[PDB]
Amino acid sequence: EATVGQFMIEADKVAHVQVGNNLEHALLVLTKTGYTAIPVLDPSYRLHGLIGTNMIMNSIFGLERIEFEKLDQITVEEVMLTDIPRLHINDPIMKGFGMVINNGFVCVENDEQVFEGIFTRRVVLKELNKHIRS
Amino acid sequence: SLQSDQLLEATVGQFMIEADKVAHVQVGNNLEHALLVLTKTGYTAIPVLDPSYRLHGLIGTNMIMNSIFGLERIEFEKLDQITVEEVMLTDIPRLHINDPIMKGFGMVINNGFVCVENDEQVFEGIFTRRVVLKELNKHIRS
Ligand SMILES: Nc1ncnc2c1ncn2[C@@H]1O[C@H](COP(=O)(O)O)[C@@H](O)[C@H]1O
Numbered sequence: 178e179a180t181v182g183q184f185m186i187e188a189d190k191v192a193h194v195q196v197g198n199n200l201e202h203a204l205l206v207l208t209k210t211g212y213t214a215i216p217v218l219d220p221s222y223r224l225h226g227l228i229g230t231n232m233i234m235n236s237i238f239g240l241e242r243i244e245f246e247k248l249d250q251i252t253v254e255e256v257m258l259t260d261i262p263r264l265h266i267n268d269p270i271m272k273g274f275g276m277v278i279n280n281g282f283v284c285v286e287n288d289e290q291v292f293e294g295i296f297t298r299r300v301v302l303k304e305l306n307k308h309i310r311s
Numbered sequence: 312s313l314q315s316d317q318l319l320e321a322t323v324g325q326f327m328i329e330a331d332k333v334a335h336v337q338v339g340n341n342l343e344h345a346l347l348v349l350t351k352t353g354y355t356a357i358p359v360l361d362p363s364y365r366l367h368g369l370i371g372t373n374m375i376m377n378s379i380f381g382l383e384r385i386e387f388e389k390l391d392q393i394t395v396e397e398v399m400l401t402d403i404p405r406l407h408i409n410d411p412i413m414k415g416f417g418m419v420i421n422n423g424f425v426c427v428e429n430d431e432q433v434f435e436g437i438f439t440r441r442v443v444l445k446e447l448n449k450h451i452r453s
Pocket residue numbers: 186190191192193211212213214215216281282295297298299421422423
């Protein structure tokens with residue numbers, strides 16, 4: 178029937194950061210793109226975790242103030258969420274639907290564990306609204 | 312406790328997260344306060360109310376960062392200086408508590424959550440993508 182890969186946002190459309198970048202870079206990309214959380218990839222386009230604005234803010238809470246000057250001394254890999262669900266391009270759409278109940282999006286990878294895209298709540302809701310309306 | 316054949320006669324208010332459970336800020340709070348609420352709760356954007364509990368807009372971390380990103384430094388002094396009113400988004404989606412639930416369903420395609428209000432724009436709660444996905448999960452399974 179319908180698969181995750183047929184509805185995901187394809188990897189070339191996905192904003193991300195690379196392993197090794199610092200949090201100033203990651204916060205700048207998040208702020209310019211407007212996204213709340215985005216994938217962390219490596220040169221091989223393998224997925225290592227997710228980095229989000231609230232993770233970043235929590236990592237610079239100092240004894241007395243929010244220590245924005247610390248952002249360029251922290252790498253994204255020290256802060257990124259690594260325990261995340263993963264889908265396969267060929268997984269049934271209903272499996273993706275289940276996984277976005279508790280996740281705003283889930284990353285999709287292929288047989289080689291290369292990042293292929295993201296499966297988001299929006300794309301599920303759009304397809305569900307269509308089905309429910311008809 | 313509704314059956315599937317009852318779902319579309321339901322209203323937004325019957326499935327919203329009630330205002331007493333919703334973190335919000337005031338138009339006259341400063342950005343440091345809003346940023347602390349956004350960060351402590353982990354929320355991406357939160358409602359902005361006035362002292363009479365009327366809904367005026369949304370404020371999110373991205374908005375605050377776009378306000379304090381300076382040329383050569385993050386201008387953190389501004390968090391104390393600027394109010395939520397100056398930075399918040401005011402052209403926001405709104406649902407009425409008595410709106411048909413299909414209106415809510417459509418509006419969360421584009422929005423992670425939609426604020427719910429009573430008459431006179433009094434804030435009542437929020438209607439989120441997860442509420443929709445969770446309820447649909449129940450009914451699509453059967
Ligand atoms: N093209 C994209 N690249 C990276 N992340 C995205 C993209 N589209 C959506 N997202 C993520 O999914 C969230 C929800 O987006 P939206 O579906 O527009 O409400 C964003 O805030 C990001 O965390």
